[PDB]
Design a protein around this motif. Structure first.
Motif, PDB file in Angstrom:
ATOM      1  N   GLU A 121      -4.462 -16.008  30.993  1.00  9.01           N
ATOM      2  CA  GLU A 121      -3.467 -14.901  30.802  1.00  9.01           C
ATOM      3  C   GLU A 121      -2.755 -15.149  29.380  1.00  9.01           C
ATOM      4  O   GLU A 121      -2.810 -14.481  28.420  1.00  9.01           O
ATOM      5  CB  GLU A 121      -2.310 -14.661  31.963  1.00  9.01           C
ATOM      6  N   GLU A 122      -2.477 -16.408  29.218  1.00  9.11           N
ATOM      7  CA  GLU A 122      -2.022 -16.619  27.831  1.00  9.11           C
ATOM      8  C   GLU A 122      -2.981 -16.649  26.594  1.00  9.11           C
ATOM      9  O   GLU A 122      -2.664 -16.214  25.519  1.00  9.11           O
ATOM     10  CB  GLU A 122      -1.612 -18.255  28.071  1.00  9.11           C
ATOM     11  N   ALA A 131     -19.673 -25.167  40.646  1.00  9.68           N
ATOM     12  CA  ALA A 131     -18.465 -24.754  40.049  1.00  9.68           C
ATOM     13  C   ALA A 131     -18.782 -24.873  38.453  1.00  9.68           C
ATOM     14  O   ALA A 131     -17.923 -25.184  37.582  1.00  9.68           O
ATOM     15  CB  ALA A 131     -17.325 -25.664  40.428  1.00  9.68           C
ATOM     16  N   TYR A 136     -21.987 -32.650  33.518  1.00 14.08           N
ATOM     17  CA  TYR A 136     -22.695 -31.478  34.210  1.00 14.08           C
ATOM     18  C   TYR A 136     -24.257 -31.201  34.010  1.00 14.08           C
ATOM     19  O   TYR A 136     -24.832 -31.634  34.976  1.00 14.08           O
ATOM     20  CB  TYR A 136     -21.967 -30.014  34.029  1.00 14.08           C
ATOM     21  N   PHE A 176      -3.125 -13.229  25.894  1.00 15.49           N
ATOM     22  CA  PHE A 176      -2.080 -12.799  25.110  1.00 15.49           C
ATOM     23  C   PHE A 176      -2.250 -13.075  23.620  1.00 15.49           C
ATOM     24  O   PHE A 176      -1.842 -12.253  22.948  1.00 15.49           O
ATOM     25  CB  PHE A 176      -0.787 -13.399  25.737  1.00 15.49           C
ATOM     26  N   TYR A 177      -2.726 -14.362  23.398  1.00 14.86           N
ATOM     27  CA  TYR A 177      -2.760 -14.796  22.085  1.00 14.86           C
ATOM     28  C   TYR A 177      -3.839 -14.197  21.323  1.00 14.86           C
ATOM     29  O   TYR A 177      -3.790 -13.926  20.382  1.00 14.86           O
ATOM     30  CB  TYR A 177      -2.860 -16.328  21.970  1.00 14.86           C
ATOM     31  N   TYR A 209      -2.929 -28.612  24.824  1.00 12.11           N
ATOM     32  CA  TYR A 209      -3.895 -28.021  25.894  1.00 12.11           C
ATOM     33  C   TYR A 209      -4.498 -26.934  25.166  1.00 12.11           C
ATOM     34  O   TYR A 209      -4.076 -26.109  24.631  1.00 12.11           O
ATOM     35  CB  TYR A 209      -3.092 -28.146  27.061  1.00 12.11           C
ATOM     36  N   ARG A 213      -2.494 -10.882  20.464  1.00 13.53           N
ATOM     37  CA  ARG A 213      -1.539 -11.011  19.081  1.00 13.53           C
ATOM     38  C   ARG A 213      -2.373 -11.316  18.000  1.00 13.53           C
ATOM     39  O   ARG A 213      -2.118 -10.671  16.873  1.00 13.53           O
ATOM     40  CB  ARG A 213      -0.790 -12.159  19.294  1.00 13.53           C
ATOM     41  N   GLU A 241      -6.123 -20.959  28.174  1.00 15.21           N
ATOM     42  CA  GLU A 241      -6.543 -20.539  29.216  1.00 15.21           C
ATOM     43  C   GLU A 241      -6.117 -19.004  29.832  1.00 15.21           C
ATOM     44  O   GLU A 241      -4.900 -19.150  30.047  1.00 15.21           O
ATOM     45  CB  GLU A 241      -6.792 -21.561  30.257  1.00 15.21           C
ATOM     46  N   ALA A 292     -19.939 -22.915  35.865  1.00 17.86           N
ATOM     47  CA  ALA A 292     -19.711 -21.979  34.908  1.00 17.86           C
ATOM     48  C   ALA A 292     -18.294 -22.206  34.734  1.00 17.86           C
ATOM     49  O   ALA A 292     -17.329 -22.270  35.609  1.00 17.86           O
ATOM     50  CB  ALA A 292     -20.240 -20.724  35.468  1.00 17.86           C
ATOM     51  N   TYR A 338      -1.278 -19.374  14.511  1.00 13.62           N
ATOM     52  CA  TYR A 338      -0.190 -18.516  15.096  1.00 13.62           C
ATOM     53  C   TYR A 338       0.880 -19.352  15.465  1.00 13.62           C
ATOM     54  O   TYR A 338       0.716 -20.517  16.071  1.00 13.62           O
ATOM     55  CB  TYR A 338      -0.558 -17.704  16.318  1.00 13.62           C
ATOM     56  N   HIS A 339       2.140 -18.887  15.004  1.00 16.03           N
ATOM     57  CA  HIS A 339       3.483 -19.605  15.381  1.00 16.03           C
ATOM     58  C   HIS A 339       4.270 -18.780  16.117  1.00 16.03           C
ATOM     59  O   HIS A 339       4.621 -17.580  15.368  1.00 16.03           O
ATOM     60  CB  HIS A 339       3.888 -20.089  14.199  1.00 16.03           C
ATOM     61  N   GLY A 372      -7.381 -27.978  30.669  1.00 18.44           N
ATOM     62  CA  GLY A 372      -6.636 -28.311  31.909  1.00 18.44           C
ATOM     63  C   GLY A 372      -7.153 -28.097  33.279  1.00 18.44           C
ATOM     64  O   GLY A 372      -7.025 -28.998  33.922  1.00 18.44           O
ATOM     65  N   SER A 373      -8.152 -26.946  33.389  1.00 17.78           N
ATOM     66  CA  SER A 373      -8.737 -26.919  34.668  1.00 17.78           C
ATOM     67  C   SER A 373      -9.933 -27.948  34.946  1.00 17.78           C
ATOM     68  O   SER A 373      -9.991 -28.374  35.848  1.00 17.78           O
ATOM     69  CB  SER A 373      -9.706 -25.445  34.478  1.00 17.78           C
ATOM     70  N   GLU A 374     -10.662 -28.329  33.817  1.00 18.84           N
ATOM     71  CA  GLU A 374     -11.351 -29.405  33.870  1.00 18.84           C
ATOM     72  C   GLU A 374     -11.056 -30.748  34.144  1.00 18.84           C
ATOM     73  O   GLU A 374     -11.822 -31.845  34.547  1.00 18.84           O
ATOM     74  CB  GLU A 374     -12.530 -29.384  32.858  1.00 18.84           C
TER      75      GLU A 374
END
Ligand code: GET
Ligand code: GET
Lengths: 203, 141, 260
Positions: free
Chosen positions: A192-193, A154, A116, A196-197, A187, A200, A190, A156, A82-83, A67-69
RNA sequence: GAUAAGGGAAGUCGGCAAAAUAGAUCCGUAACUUCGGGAUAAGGAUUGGCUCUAAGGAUCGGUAACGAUCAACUUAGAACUGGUACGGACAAGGGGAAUCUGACUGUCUAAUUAAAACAUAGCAUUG
RNA sequence: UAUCUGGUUGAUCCUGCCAGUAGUCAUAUGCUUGUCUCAAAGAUUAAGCCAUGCAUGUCUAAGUAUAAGCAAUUUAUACAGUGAAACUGCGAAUGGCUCAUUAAAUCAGUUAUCGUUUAUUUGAUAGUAUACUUGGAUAACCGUGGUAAUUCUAGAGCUAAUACAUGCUUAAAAUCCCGACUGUUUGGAAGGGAUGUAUUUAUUAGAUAAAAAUUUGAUGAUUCAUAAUAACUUUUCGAAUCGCAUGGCCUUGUGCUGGCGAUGGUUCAUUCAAAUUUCUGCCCUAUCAACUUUCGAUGGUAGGAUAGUGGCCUACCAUGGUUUCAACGGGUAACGGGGAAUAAGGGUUCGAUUCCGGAGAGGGAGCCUGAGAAACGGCUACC
RNA sequence: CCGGUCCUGGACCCAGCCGAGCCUUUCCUUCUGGCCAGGACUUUUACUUUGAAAAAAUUAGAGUGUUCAAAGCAGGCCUUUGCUCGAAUAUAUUAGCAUGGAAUAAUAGAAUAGGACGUUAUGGUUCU
RNA sequence: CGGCACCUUACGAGAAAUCAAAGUCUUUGGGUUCUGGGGGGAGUAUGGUCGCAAGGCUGAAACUUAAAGGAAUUGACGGAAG
RNA sequence: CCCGUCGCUACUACCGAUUGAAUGGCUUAGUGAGGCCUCCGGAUUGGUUUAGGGAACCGAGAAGCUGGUCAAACUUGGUCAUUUAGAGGAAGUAAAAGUCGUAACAAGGUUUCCGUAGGUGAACCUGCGGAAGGAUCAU
RNA sequence: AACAUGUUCUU
């Protein structure tokens, strides 16, 4: 067959409703695809209005996004790790939406290096150091060197994403609905998500 | 009250926090105005709760009918039942009888509602078996 | 009921067609087309029950199979074509022209017009938005779509359209002071002029109107058809009466006065 | 001491003898009743092996809602698997509708009678 | 017409009912029955059972013609007219019948779709980075038949398309990514790619509180419309079709060209629909007071399924939801409504049935086709 | 009453009814552009007024020698190569929508003040 | 002031007996609870419920029938009185 | 005038051994047709198209097979409702002139009546408390 | 002190 009507349920007061009419075709359901990881097999479904759906019964590859790139490539799916709704889908590698999966990290690595000039993995073994020395000593024309300089600063990326590039498999979330579209797309995890995973998973 | 208290990750749809964009290195938050003159609460905008059924921080639109009533239960997670009192006219006796209906409505965590308070609820899409309304304004009991 | 209805019972047909009760069980069912089923007048009614040009529907079929009958200039052979508001019906074989216009009593009067007149019409702007490739269009009340309209046009505006090329000639902005003509409701068929408009968010907007004779009458915004720019100047011809309601005693007095 | 086609008490004074049931979990359980019962009423389903999942703790160390170390066998669920087997030997109720009779638990004819007989609490009478 | 009269007593005044009286688009029945206009009619019991016949088919000049069918010789040795059969397309989901089920169900008025599908109609709307026009199947048809029998069909030989599958005919400049060399404080450049529209995902436009030291749509309201970027797809479609007139230009070649049309096609709009949906409103019954929650009951998160919302279904979790303002249960000789009868007023009673809405096709269930059916004058199975 | 009479006509006085606006300690939102049109706020209800809209058929009801009438929505005209009025109007409204009124009947308010105003009060902390 | 009553009247009420409420009720509306709808069958049967029992509470229908009943009048009768 | 038992006859309803019977609905469990999805399968067939004789490997694909899903229907059991047979038992009502007595109406010859409890061919009698609707509005 | 009874149906 399978039905989506609300008449078969109890009222909010709790009364048991009486039969009103025979089952209607405009309120049907169908069988879950239960998509698996294997050679592609996609079955069409004729739906209401003459439209078409695609039941992915087995899929090999999916279109995944960093997403970021701002780039996405047609990688391949390793497994399901994981589900959120049922551990029975991870235990049997069933692909539905919001399944946490590992994909091949290789095409994003190629894009990183070509767009890059730096490399990922950062591990300092034998093959890793050999490939790093190869990449840092590649043959770059002066204009490509300057355009890569315009792409510097940018270069890194976040420490959690690139750390996983040692294994050649990233963590992703399926965002498509394979039983409805026949695509198994997603996707890269990245931030926080991702934390979190990982919390888990490793647990 | 922990925001990520499920087996899945809670986030708003398509609101991306590019972790290295320029300077706003914060979890971006989306909302809307529900229209019809109703005020967006401040706890919705500078908040952290995730609610797909919030009128402000979620994807449901308000349209249809606006109702008011007294809250008789908050014993459910993030939904309430309100009581609408009314009088039914019986023409033969030229008089009225007291009748009531119970309505179930969604209450966003942006609000602090308790039994005895008067709410205004706006109609939304069916978001539950019984819920077609959604708290928009809260007054004292 | 398993699928779309193809019959219209006689008693369920709109009353503004003045269909006699005891002729037979059924009524013409207007085809899908430019206008709503209820707010349109199918051509068989126009060419049989109004003009008496045909004794029955078979002769209506014969007449239209010979390219005689036209709607908005184009030739139509659909006997049940949903001709509606502002439509122009051309009859070259008879050398005669018409325009469907609401007489004040509430119906479609037999409004004869001239050949020069029978070459244009008017259209209310339902909405304005961008299509594919960013091209703007506006939708009119007759299902006509026009691309590249004036960038100022919005909803509730009347446009002039040429019946040959489908192009827009000139239009009207919706604001206080416009001559209009009520499209539905109890105020059907009457011609007024805008006085004021009251805006209810989420509800149905209300508009206040006045006839030539001083009579203030309110109506739903969705029933307002702008027909001019000022009082006294329509952009089409008006029927015998000019859209002013007369009470039953007034009409009785006028009938006695005319007949002696 | 066993088994037996088809029938299933037609045998017999009489179902005598035998058979059938049986552990555990979950479900479901009538009349009647002294309200305590009846009741395991009746009547159903499940049970192996393997591979997993979850729950239920102890002791130390200062939003400790945490870490570290230790530790017992119970419970619930899922996948797979077999000649559909599995309380696999062992162990282990047949059930129902009524009549006569004694309330009940208890007692006696050692060596042909265990009962409806005796006792019993309760009730009454007598000195 | 806002009306009463007879009957308890030897006589009286009352209560009170029985009886009388009049209507019923309310049904049966008896008797009788000259004329005209208008007119209901196997609802009530049995949504019981049905012999026979009919009720849905469909061709224009413009889809496909070697009928070994008919007519005549004609601007037609590829056909050209009329016209069986058959292929293809469309319709058969309308209508008509009935009132069995059904009591917040249906239905009525009133809402919503910023929660979806939609043949058709009508508007629009695509130049996208072998082409003097590609293939192979089968019907119709002649021919051998098999079964007691059915709107049963098998072998064999031809042969078509708007059937089936394939495939080019093409503008103009411009943008972007990769970039071997090269200029040299950062330019040019050979050579490669993508250009449409569909599909899926991710990320950015989609702004408009008023003065110091640039363009931007709609709504009450959106993650709306629309646009861009990177990628994705058992690649959607951007016309290998048809009739009548045959014109104009010569650089005279079976040349370049071009008139009304048929049919078809992606997306959006509209129209005809559909599916859900808000608020309020149903008869009798407590000799029905608690009901719902195992196996979804009320809610939350995630998914699956749907055309789409939603416990519609699954997994995990919480313990909720309705009720004396009558829930839940039971009855209905209950389809709802517009309406009907009687009517001082207020009321009472009726509405199977000419219109609207629903439901069903002996009972149940499950499906195919299709835009649309859980279809019965369609299929499948059980009774 | 002038009276002005062709049933009806104008300034003046009289009274009667339905209304408006100002002033009385004064309710009647509030700013911007600058009697409308875009912002900032609103204690909740019942009741009553008015209106939008509300299928035909049926009902009530205006026009019509269906010869009458029940009905129907037609028909009538110098007799034409035509002309013609029509196909009225109310009733619907329990519920929903919009709207005027503020009696009647409710609801809220400032009591450990945690109350109201400071327009261009004063200072401080945040945002845009 | 409160209470148990009483006597007269009858404006008023009532079918009357009578009534200071049984009045202020066709000139019909202060608030509110309960009960009845010709006579029987029948407070029976049945179901439920309370009770040790006796019973209490709740509570039908089939069927039957032209009156039953209230208050007063005149007579007659009385093992009523004068 | 009038009460009850008793006798003849007719009609209605009730209780009742028969784990009575029949009909209709709902339902646990057991079995389960068929379609749909899925899974393999591969009669047959054309060649992604190529091989000196043709050997690969493309496509299309029927029957059948696996596992699901919806689920008719049958058996068993349960429950609900509605009709209905029944020895015998106990009522009610009706029906000119049958039997026994005379309870009530007069102080009805023991004032009547209410509740309760015993007794008795029958009306009814008796005890305890109550009422006047009494035969006393009073010493 | 004792004192029970009076077929049916009217005019
Ligand atoms: C043995 N006791 C009895 C008691 O059973 C009862 O008797 C009834 C009696 O009333 C009934 O009598 C019933 O029916 C008779 C019949 C002639 O119509 C009539 O007397 C009258 O209608 C009615 N009472 C009778 N049929 C049965 C007895 N056991 O009542 C009287 C009694 C003496 O106490
Ligand atoms: C007043 N009480 C009476 C009692 O006296 C008795 O009365 C009978 C009566 O029933 C007889 O009468 C009865 O029987 C006759 C006939 C069948 O004998 C019928 O004709 C008559 O209609 C019927 N009522 C009658 N003939 C003599 C009275 N004593 O009958 C019983 C009873 C009801 O309790």
């Amino acid at each position: 067959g399978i039905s989506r009507d609300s008449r078969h349920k109890r009222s909010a007061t709790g009364a048991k409703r009486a039969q009103f009419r025979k089952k209607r075709k405009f309120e049907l359901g169908r069988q879950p695809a239960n998509t698996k990881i294997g050679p592609k097999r996609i079955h069409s479904v004729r739906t209401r209005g003459g439209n078409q759906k695609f039941r992915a019964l087995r899929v090999e590859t999916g279109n995944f996004s960093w997403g970021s790139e701002g780039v996405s490539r047609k990688t391949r799916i390793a497994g399901v790790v994981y589900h959120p709704s049922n551990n029975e889908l991870v235990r049997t590698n069933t692909l539905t939406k919001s399944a946490v999966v590992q994909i091949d990290a290789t095409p994003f690595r190629q894009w990183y290096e070509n767009h890059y000039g730096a490399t990922l993995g950062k591990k300092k073994g034998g093959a890793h150091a050999a490939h790093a020395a190869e990449v840092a000593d590649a043959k770059r024309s002066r204009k490509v060197e300057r355009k890569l300089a315009a792409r510097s600063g940018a270069a890194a990326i976040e420490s959690a994403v690139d750390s996983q590039f040692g294994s050649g498999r990233l963590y992703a979330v399926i965002s498509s609905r394979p039983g409805q579209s026949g695509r198994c797309d997603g996707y890269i995890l990245e931030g926080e998500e991702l934390a979190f995973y990982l919390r888990r998973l490793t647990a | 009250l922990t925001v990520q208290s499920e087996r899945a990750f809670q986030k708003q749809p398509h609101i991306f926090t590019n972790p290295k964009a320029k300077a706003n290195k914060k979890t971006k938050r989306w909302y809307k105005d529900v229209g019809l003159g109703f005020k967006t609460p401040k706890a919705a905008i500078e908040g952290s709760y995730i609610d797909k059924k919030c009128p402000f921080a979620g994807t449901v639109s308000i349209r249809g009918k606006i109702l008011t009533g007294t809250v008789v239960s908050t014993k459910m997670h993030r939904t309430i039942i309100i009581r609408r009192d009314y009088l039914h006219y019986v023409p033969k006796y030229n008089r009225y009888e007291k009748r009531h209906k119970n309505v179930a409505a969604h209450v966003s965590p942006a609000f602090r509602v308790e039994e005895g308070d008067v709410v205004t609820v706006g109609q939304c899409r069916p978001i539950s078996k019984t819920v077609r309304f959604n708290v928009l304004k809260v007054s004292a009991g | 009921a398993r699928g779309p209805k193809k019959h219209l019972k006689r008693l369920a047909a709109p009353s503004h067609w003045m269909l006699d009760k005891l002729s037979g069980t059924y009524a013409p069912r207007p085809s899908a087309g430019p206008h709503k089923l209820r707010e349109s007048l199918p051509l068989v009614v126009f060419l049989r029950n109004r003009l008496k040009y045909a004794l029955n529907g078979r002769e209506v079929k014969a007449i239209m199979m010979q390219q005689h009958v036209q709607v908005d200039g184009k030739v139509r052979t659909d006997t049940t074509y949903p001709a509606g508001f502002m439509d122009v019906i051309t009859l070259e074989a008879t050398n005669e022209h018409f325009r469907l216009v609401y007489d004040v009593k509430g119906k479609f009067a037999v409004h004869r017009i001239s050949a020069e007149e029978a070459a244009y019409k008017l259209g209310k702007v339902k909405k304005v938005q961008l299509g594919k490739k960013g091209v703007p269009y506006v939708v009119t009340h007759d299902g006509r779509t026009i691309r590249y309209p004036d960038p100022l046009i919005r909803a509730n505006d009347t446009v002039k359209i040429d019946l040959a090329t489908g192009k827009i000639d000139d239009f009207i902005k919706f604001d206080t002071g416009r001559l209009v003509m009520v499209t539905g409701g109890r105020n059907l068929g009457r011609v007024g002029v805008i006085v004021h408009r009251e805006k209810h968010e989420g509800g149905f907007d209300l508009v206040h109107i006045k006839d030539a004779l001083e009579n203030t009458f309110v109506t739903r915004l969705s029933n307002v058809f702008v027909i001019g720019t000022e009082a006294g100047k329509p952009w089409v011809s008006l029927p015998k009466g000019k859209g002013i309601k007369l009470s039953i005693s007034e009409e009785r007095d006028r009938r006695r006065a005319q007949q002696g």
